Amino acid sequence: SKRNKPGKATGKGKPVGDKWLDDAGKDSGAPIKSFDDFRKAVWEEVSKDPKSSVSKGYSPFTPKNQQVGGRKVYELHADKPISQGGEVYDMDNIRVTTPKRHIDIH
DNA sequence: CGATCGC
């Protein structure tokens, strides 16, 4: 299982602004030791880049209507799936999504 | 030995 076995970061990401999560629950989605540690380290720098969630590392909750049942936070979708070639840590491949947006696509 | 996302 790739998502567990370790790797290193690649890809610059893309430039956005203060209203950057609105594009998570839209279409493709918003750009940006284990993926278990990389996700934290993503949202830990979301706190330090100018709330209580991100600061401890967790994913922030979404709007009520972009939630599906017990799925309620932002999700890092891999555009090109890992089983079919996709690089886990391709900062360029990861799309910030919401439970409903993510669900449709798949 | 489900895939794919979260804690």
Place this chain on the structure above:
DNA sequence: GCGATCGC
């Protein structure tokens, strides 16, 4: 380790 949704 564990939890969630979808599954033609």
